[PDB]
Amino acid sequence: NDTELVACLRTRPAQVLVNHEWHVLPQESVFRFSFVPVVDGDFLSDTPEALINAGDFHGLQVLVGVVKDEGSYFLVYGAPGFSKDNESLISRAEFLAGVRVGVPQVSDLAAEAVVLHYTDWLHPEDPARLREALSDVVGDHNVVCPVAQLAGRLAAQGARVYAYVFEHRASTLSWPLWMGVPHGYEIEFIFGIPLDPSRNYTAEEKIFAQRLMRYWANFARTGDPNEPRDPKAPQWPPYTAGAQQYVSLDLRPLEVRRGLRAQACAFWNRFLPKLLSAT
Amino acid sequence: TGGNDTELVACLRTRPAQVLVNHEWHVLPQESVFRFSFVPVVDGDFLSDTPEALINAGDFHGLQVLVGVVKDEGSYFLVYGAPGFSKDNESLISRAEFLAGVRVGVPQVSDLAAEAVVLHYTDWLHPEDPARLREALSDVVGDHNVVCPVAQLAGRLAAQGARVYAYVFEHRASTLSWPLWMGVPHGYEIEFIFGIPLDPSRNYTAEEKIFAQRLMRYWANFARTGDPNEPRDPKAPQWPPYTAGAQQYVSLDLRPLEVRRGLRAQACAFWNRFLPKLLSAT
Amino acid sequence: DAELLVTVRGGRLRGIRLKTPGGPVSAFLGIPFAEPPMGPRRFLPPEPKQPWSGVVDATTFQSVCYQYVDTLYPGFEGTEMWNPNRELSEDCLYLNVWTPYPRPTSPTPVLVWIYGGGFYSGASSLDVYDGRFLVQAERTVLVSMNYRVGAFGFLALPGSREAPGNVGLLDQRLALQWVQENVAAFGGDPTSVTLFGESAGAASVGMHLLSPPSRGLFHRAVLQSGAPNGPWATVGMGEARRRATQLAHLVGCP
Amino acid sequence: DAELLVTVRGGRLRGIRLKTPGGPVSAFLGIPFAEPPMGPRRFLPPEPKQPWSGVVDATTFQSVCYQYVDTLYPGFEGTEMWNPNRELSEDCLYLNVWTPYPRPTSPTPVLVWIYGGGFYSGASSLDVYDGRFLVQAERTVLVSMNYRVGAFGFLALPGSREAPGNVGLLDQRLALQWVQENVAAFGGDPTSVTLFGESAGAASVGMHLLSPPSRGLFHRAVLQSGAPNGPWATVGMGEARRRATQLAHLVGCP
Numbered sequence A: 001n002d003t004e005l006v007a008c009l010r011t012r013p014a015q016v017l018v019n020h021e022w023h024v025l026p027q028e029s030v031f032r033f034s035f036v037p038v039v040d041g042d043f044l045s046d047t048p049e050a051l052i053n054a055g056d057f058h059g060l061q062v063l064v065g066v067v068k069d070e071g072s073y074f075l076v077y078g079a080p081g082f083s084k085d086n087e088s089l090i091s092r093a094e095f096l097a098g099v100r101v102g103v104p105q106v107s108d109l110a111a112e113a114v115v116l117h118y119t120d121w122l123h124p125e126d127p128a129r130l131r132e133a134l135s136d137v138v139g140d141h142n143v144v145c146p147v148a149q150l151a152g153r154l155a156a157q158g159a160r161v162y163a164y165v166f167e168h169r170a171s172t173l174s175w176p177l178w179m180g181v182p183h184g185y186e187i188e189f190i191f192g193i194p195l196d197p198s199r200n201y202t203a204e205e206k207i208f209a210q211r212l213m214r215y216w217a218n219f220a221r222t223g224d225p226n227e228p229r230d231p232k233a234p235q236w237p238p239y240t241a242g243a244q245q246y247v248s249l250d251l252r253p254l255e256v257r258r259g260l261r262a263q264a265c266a267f268w269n270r271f272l273p274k275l276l277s278a279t
Numbered sequence B: 001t002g003g004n005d006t007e008l009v010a011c012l013r014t015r016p017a018q019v020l021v022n023h024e025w026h027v028l029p030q031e032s033v034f035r036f037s038f039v040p041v042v043d044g045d046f047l048s049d050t051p052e053a054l055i056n057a058g059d060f061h062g063l064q065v066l067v068g069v070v071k072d073e074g075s076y077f078l079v080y081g082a083p084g085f086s087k088d089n090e091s092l093i094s095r096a097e098f099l100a101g102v103r104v105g106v107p108q109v110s111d112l113a114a115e116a117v118v119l120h121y122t123d124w125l126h127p128e129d130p131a132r133l134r135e136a137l138s139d140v141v142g143d144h145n146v147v148c149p150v151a152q153l154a155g156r157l158a159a160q161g162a163r164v165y166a167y168v169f170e171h172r173a174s175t176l177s178w179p180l181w182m183g184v185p186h187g188y189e190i191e192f193i194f195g196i197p198l199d200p201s202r203n204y205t206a207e208e209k210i211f212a213q214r215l216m217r218y219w220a221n222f223a224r225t226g227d228p229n230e231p232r233d234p235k236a237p238q239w240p241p242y243t244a245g246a247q248q249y250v251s252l253d254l255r256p257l258e259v260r261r262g263l264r265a266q267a268c269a270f271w272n273r274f275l276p277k278l279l280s281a282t
Numbered sequence C, D: 001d002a003e004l005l006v007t008v009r010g011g012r013l014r015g016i017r018l019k020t021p022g023g024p025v026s027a028f029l030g031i032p033f034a035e036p037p038m039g040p041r042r043f044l045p046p047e048p049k050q051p052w053s054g055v056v057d058a059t060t061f062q063s064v065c066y067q068y069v070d071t072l073y074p075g076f077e078g079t080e081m082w083n084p085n086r087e088l089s090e091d092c093l094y095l096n097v098w099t100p101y102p103r104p105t106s107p108t109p110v111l112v113w114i115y116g117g118g119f120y121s122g123a124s125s126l127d128v129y130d131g132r133f134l135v136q137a138e139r140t141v142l143v144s145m146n147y148r149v150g151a152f153g154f155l156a157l158p159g160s161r162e163a164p165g166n167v168g169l170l171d172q173r174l175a176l177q178w179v180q181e182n183v184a185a186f187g188g189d190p191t192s193v194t195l196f197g198e199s200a201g202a203a204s205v206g207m208h209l210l211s212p213p214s215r216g217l218f219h220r221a222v223l224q225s226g227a228p229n230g231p232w233a234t235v236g237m238g239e240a241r242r243r244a245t246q247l248a249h250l251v252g253c254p
């Protein structure tokens, strides 16, 4: 019956499989995709979270980072009352609904906990706060805190780890202003696209991309993004699990900041899975 | 005639009063700060139901209420039972002393529930800074026991027909004998409201007598008219009424009145809204 | 002089002149409002003080209700200011009245103070509660009372007639009833009494607020650093019976 | 000019000189690294490309792996910059190499890009992923590959020889093996390979850190806005069957 099944799928034309693809999702959601790597015991011996803290990471150099507004892009694909064509000034009613779709497959009590931490209890009805709040929920749950977990665990088992936050909005960006620096919009700069004369980037963005291309290939060359010996600029300190240092990739020079959304990921990485496994 | 309850009380009435006192603290269910053995009982007589239930369902049109807290409610209690605390040093507690202090400050609460307290109250950038942890525990106890109970009551009276005024008292008496780290501790506004600085023998500062004369006036005024403000002094800084939406209060200190919003709004959502839900579903 | 002799419903009183920097104040300290809650009346609701012959000496605070006396920092002002400054006695249900010296010719609003203390301690006689400055400053009448604390005020075997709980609150209500009937003799206005109290005194104010029989005895309420809905200010029935039974065990009562 | 004819283990290739403000790099686009994964090979792990006679036209980008195409905002740049820019085909296991124009005389480190788009979309031929500027400005060797997305690369019936799952990752691994064997032909150093990727590509890089058979094929890792341990990049064997068997039912199978 198992081989009987796949044989029938192999006779279906490719586009019909693509048509029904999003239907197999369990519970309506955002930032969730039907067909992803499976923890089979072959390619992945165990869940990634298990593999991550009993791993072979000493001697490995890792460069990790996030954009300033990780969540915005995904809200227009499922969150109630969102669009690139208005301000997305949602109601509290819409905010609540969006939590259950931003954090799907989670108990009623767990969702109360998300609302507890991301609501502003002086201004629980304010649409602009609710908008950026739901952005942070989706951004922290899916990107920032999983990255922050990975960094410190690698660091703790002997990886040399460097961490950035990319917070520059391309003047070319077609997405509306309330999305900030959306998911995926550091790429153009890492690849030097500003250098293309066909494109309309600033002169001052051209120097930015050259500085990022320098960091990335300094890393590929040497495992250290830092300009070797160069003391004119601030140093980019490696991320440790104690001091938790990262840099801002900005049109300004390197600002070295401590703590990679610490209070949020305490909830996402430690308290929430306790709540989940006790209710 | 005996039954058994009547037996119990008849015997207790034969003991000298001192004998009963010397065993009072011994009947508490566990180790704890800011817990007392013999308090009002929800028996259906005096209190027809729990105070919380009465508030939620009560109608308070025609009532004026004046409520407030001091800056550091919790600090006084820590020295009576929390590990590492003393009036006589800086009380720079360790993290393990802090975690143990949370089980004493929040007794009768599950492991998961105290995780949630540690989640809210530690600085996961500096999980171990002793000064930061001292203030954190001071906030856990003072929030859980005073401020969020007050803020819950005040929002509900206001929303259900009362007319409420709220303050934070945040002046530290120049004569205060407790150490600096406790700040403005529980009970140290009373001196000023009874105008004790006016007493020539107590060695208060001249500006402090003015402050008390001011504060007595707010209190008298409220007694007189249910409104602390002065009716014929419009241009004096108005004390607006606390409401559940805008959550406005004033700061009472040596500077002229200042309006703030939100009585530790972020903390009190945990204590008054989430924590109860957590204890139920587990 | 003749301002210091006053007759209330149950007999005559003689008060004292208190001096302040602004001027003098008439004070009547230690007025009995209940028959001593003693012997068989321990743990029972208070009974109104019956009338007396002669003049009661109302010139200094009466006794402090029996309580645990704190000894963490002996002799240290920050703790001693809350400790008893009179002898302990179960005979303690007395209240105090301060009134502006020239006894107000028109009815003055009245403030009634309920001391805090965790429901296990406190006394109306503490120096920090001296009403003389508030009266002289704002020309208002101020009343404060003692109420049984600890086991004497709040031990409860719920459902029994012999230890029914909350009698400390009932002491407070009796004193409010006394104000309603007698404050007008000092110049006060029974139709404008404001309750105020700190910590457990504040929680007490909250409860009179939520207890219909108290709610005709005051017009407005002030709660300082306390609320009846706090985690420490009430106990369940099963828990109160559990603590009353353990006290009796520790003390030898079968 | 002569540096545009290069020979890998599979056979001969013909490339293109590409233009940059700084000067040219020379690129090889659409190199076959797998036998086309189709017909009976749909859902199966990739097989390595059998060798070829003649010269392979490695001058344009090859097809995009079959995928959903975003219709939310039609014509909108921010939406469309991620949509495929070559015809869709299941015949899509092709990779590309950019190398500095005067080919490095010494072995130079290799950057390997893995595109994202939540494992249901993406292609190595998008304009944002263009390697000419990084290779000209920094004189590294850049490789990017296409891998099967959606059901074509990740439908799994765990336990069956027929849809073992993760075959889109096996596609990436096959490509990394390719660079171990052949990046030397372009001036690259097989002992100095750095993976980088974004979104699901960052998740992929992460998984290669955690799968022992991939650890011999690179030495460093950059992960941009993604991680293998997040809540969306993995599913359990039971969920994978649930989602696989539902598609089959939604499509008339059994």
Ligand SMILES: *[C@@H]1O[C@H](CO[C@@H]2O[C@@H](C)[C@@H](O)[C@@H](O)[C@@H]2O)[C@@H](O[C@@H]2O[C@H](CO)[C@@H](O[C@@H]3O[C@H](CO)[C@@H](O)[C@H](O)[C@@H]3O)[C@H](O)[C@H]2NC(C)=O)[C@H](O)[C@H]1NC(C)=O
Pocket: B081, B082, B083, B084, B085, B086, B088, B089, B090, B091, B092, B093
């Ligand atoms: C601040 O002070 C507290 C309280 O200690 C008291 O005040 C100090 C000024 C000292 O003079 C103390 O002697 C005094 O009691 C410190 O916490 C206390 O530490 C002592 C140890 O020095 C504890 O005593 C021990 O108790 C255990 C049993 O639990 C015995 O086995 C030991 O032999 C020893 O006697 C004491 O319990 C503890 N008090 C509390 C409430 O936890 C505190 O360490 C100090 N802070 C700093 C930063 O130094």
Ligand SMILES: CC(=O)N[C@@H]1[C@@H](O)[C@H](O[C@@H]2O[C@H](CO)[C@H](O)[C@H](O[C@]3(C(=O)O)C[C@H](O)[C@@H](NC(C)=O)[C@H]([C@H](O)[C@H](O)CO)O3)[C@H]2O)[C@@H](CO)O[C@H]1O
Pocket: A042, D045, D046, D047, D048, D164, D170, D171, D173, D174, D177, D181, D213, D214
């Ligand atoms: C490059 C060369 O000289 N010869 C290669 C040969 O090494 C290679 O064999 C594969 O080598 C890799 C090393 O990275 C692994 O050890 C392969 O094992 C696995 C894998 O884990 O990748 C085992 C796994 O169970 C398989 N999955 C199945 C059967 O579902 C995969 C799978 O067969 C994929 O095709 C691998 O991409 O392989 C080991 O087989 C082969 C390619 O497989 O190519 C030669 O040219």
Ligand SMILES: *[C@@H]1O[C@H](CO[C@@H]2O[C@@H](C)[C@@H](O)[C@@H](O)[C@@H]2O)[C@@H](O[C@@H]2O[C@H](CO)[C@@H](O)[C@H](O)[C@H]2NC(C)=O)[C@H](O)[C@H]1NC(C)=O
Pocket: A079, A080, A081, A082, A083, A085, A086, A087, A088, A089, A090
């Ligand atoms: C912001 O826009 C969304 C998206 O709606 C579309 O885009 C708008 C520009 C407008 O042209 C709508 O008519 C489009 O359908 C709004 O979400 C929908 O709003 C309509 C009515 O406003 C409602 O009938 C739908 O149910 C909404 N979709 C949901 C709830 O999923 C949203 O309301 C807009 N917000 C504001 C503040 O205007």
Ligand SMILES: OC[C@H]1O[C@@H](OCCCCc2cn(CCCCc3ccc(O)c(/C=N\O)n3)nn2)[C@H](O)[C@@H](O)[C@@H]1O
Pocket: B025, B026, B034, B035, B077, B080, B081, B187, C070, C082, C116, C117, C118, C119, C198, C199, C200, C201
């Ligand atoms: O054999 C002696 C027993 O003594 C016990 O003492 C327990 C701790 C010490 C007592 C204690 C005091 N405090 C607060 C003190 C007054 C502060 C206060 C409290 C409530 C209020 O409302 C107000 C308002 N205005 O004042 N103020 N809390 N606890 C020990 O367990 C042990 O030594 C032994 O069993």
Ligand SMILES: OC[C@H]1O[C@@H](OCCCCc2cn(CCCCc3ccc(O)c(/C=N\O)n3)nn2)[C@H](O)[C@@H](O)[C@@H]1O
Pocket: C106, C107, C180, C189, C190, C191, C192, C193, C215, C216, C217, C218, C219, C220
């Ligand atoms: O506040 C507390 C509560 O007490 C209720 O009252 C019941 C009082 C029972 C006795 C009683 C006395 N009195 C005369 C009042 C003085 C009248 C007066 C006022 C101002 C003046 O200037 C003058 C001038 N010259 O004499 N006189 N009436 N009844 C309330 O009803 C309830 O609202 C409240 O909660």
Ligand SMILES: [Cl-]
Pocket: A012, A013, A014, A015
């Ligand atoms: Cl087809």
Ligand SMILES: [Cl-]
Pocket: A074, A077
């Ligand atoms: Cl998406």
Ligand SMILES: [Cl-]
Pocket: A107, A108, A109
């Ligand atoms: Cl549920």
Ligand SMILES: [Cl-]
Pocket: A122, A123, A124, A125, A126
């Ligand atoms: Cl608002």
Ligand SMILES: [Cl-]
Pocket: none
């Ligand atoms: Cl605002």
Ligand SMILES: [Cl-]
Pocket: none
């Ligand atoms: Cl340079």
Ligand SMILES: [Cl-]
Pocket: A256, A257, A258, A259
């Ligand atoms: Cl910082």
Ligand SMILES: [Cl-]
Pocket: A261, A262, A263, A264
């Ligand atoms: Cl944070």
Ligand SMILES: [Cl-]
Pocket: A068, A165, A260, A261
């Ligand atoms: Cl951040």
Ligand SMILES: [Cl-]
Pocket: A117, A263, A264, A267
């Ligand atoms: Cl949080």
Ligand SMILES: [Cl-]
Pocket: B062, B226
């Ligand atoms: Cl009124």
